Amino acid sequence: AEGIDVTLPSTRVPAGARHPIIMLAEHVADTFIAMGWELAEGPEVETEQF
Amino acid sequence: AEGIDVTLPSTRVPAGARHPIIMLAEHVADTFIAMGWELAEGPEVETEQF
């Protein structure tokens, strides 16, 4: 007796996901960090001088 | 209209934590991987030859 349905849904938290483009950028970054490189940043609104 | 108490507890999931020793190993591994090194493994029960 005391038998339960072990296949009943147990996830009360909705499905979440990071964007694949962010995931690809994350994997690309990890590849270059593992080779000794670093991550630089820059503003989106740029001067014409640069 | 009456406002709510914005400081009421909202975290219904208990507090979790990774072990500090595991996190220190993660930071140590990240430090050497950022220099080009890699991570090698080995069983804990070893032969006396090795």
Residue B38 and residue A37 in contact, taking contact as beta carbons nearer than 8 Å = no
Instruction: List the resolution, Å.
Output: 2.5
Contact A36 B33 (CB under 8 A): no
Phi-psi region of A9 (alpha: psi -120 to 50; beta: other; left: phi over 0): beta
Cβ neighbours of B34 in A, within 8 Å: 33-34, 36
Look at residues A23, A50, A26, A49 and name the one whose alpha carbon lies nearest to residue A39.
A26
* DSSP conformation class of B48: T
Technique of determination: X-ray
How far apart CA A35 and CA B34 sit, in angstroms, is: 7
Task: Answer whether A4 touches B (CB < 8 Å).
Answer: no
Interface of A with B in 11-40 (CB under 8 A): 33-36
